[PDB]
């Protein structure tokens, strides 16, 4: 029927950390004002990417139990979930945070930045697909926390300790789906987005092959 006091606590802590995330106004302004060319457009995206990583590192550190993990496991989680967590954040920015005029200018910059349509087309399909679900802020926060605390990233020493942090989050999300949408396939649809995000590791890897970025981007990718 409802979340236990322990599950409410976990959700509260995650929501707090999710709400403290902010895309600077300086960045939204650049989307609107900066010169329109492949080099300038690619440079704005590079800036947005660096900021997403900074925002996601700050969110991750505050996740319940993340700090109890080994420091080397903490880095493997950040490096392994980067691409996936960024797309999830960029989808929320594109679908919910930006005004309708700004989204249009951003799409125009994305499509004219040197990045292949082979990458850009499933990105926008994913954006439309996540937009269709009409996800609450709780669902975006929990999915982001679930993506980050994935126990099957490369170079994780203590996978079991990571599982113990991810599993109660999966339990909370399913319970929320039952409470908010008592549409019984809503959880399965959210899981579908998790597997859809995984395909982006492949499109990003093929893009990287063809220090044009930032030191944080070179380190995390």
């Amino acid at each position: 029927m409802e979340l236990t006091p322990d599950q409410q606590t976990l959700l509260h802590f995650i929501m707090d950390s999710y709400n403290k995330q902010r895309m600077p106004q300086e960045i939204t302004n650049k989307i609107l004002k900066e010169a329109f060319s492949a080099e300038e457009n690619f440079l704005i995206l590079t800036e947005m990417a660096t900021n997403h990583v900074q925002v996601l590192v700050e969110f991750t550190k505050k996740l319940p139990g993340f700090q109890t993990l080994d420091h080397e496991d903490q880095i493997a989680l950040l490096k392994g979930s980067a691409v996936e967590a960024m797309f999830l954040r960029s989808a929320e920015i594109f679908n919910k945070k930006l005004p309708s005029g700004h989204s249009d200018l951003l799409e125009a910059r994305i499509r004219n930045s040197g990045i292949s349509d082979e990458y850009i087309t499933p990105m926008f399909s994913f954006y439309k697909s996540i937009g269709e679900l009409k996800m609450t802020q709780e669902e975006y926060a929990l999915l982001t926390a679930i993506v980050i605390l994935s126990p099957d990233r490369q170079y994780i020493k203590d996978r079991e300790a990571v599982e113990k942090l991810q599993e109660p989050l999966l339990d909370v999300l399913q319970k929320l789906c039952k409470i908010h949408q008592p549409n019984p396939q809503h959880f399965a649809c959210l899981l579908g987005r998790l597997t859809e995000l995984r395909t982006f590791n492949h499109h990003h890897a093929e893009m990287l092959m063809s220090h044009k970025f930032t030191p944080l981007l070179c380190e995390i990718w």
């Binding site: 590192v57 550190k61 950040l78 490096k79 944080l216 380190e219 995390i220």
Partner: peptide, 12 residues
């Protein structure tokens, strides 16, 4: 390796 990443992780 991961010097910038470690810094953001260890700050406060």
């Amino acid at each position: 390796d991961h010097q910038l990443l470690r810094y953001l992780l260890d700050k406060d």
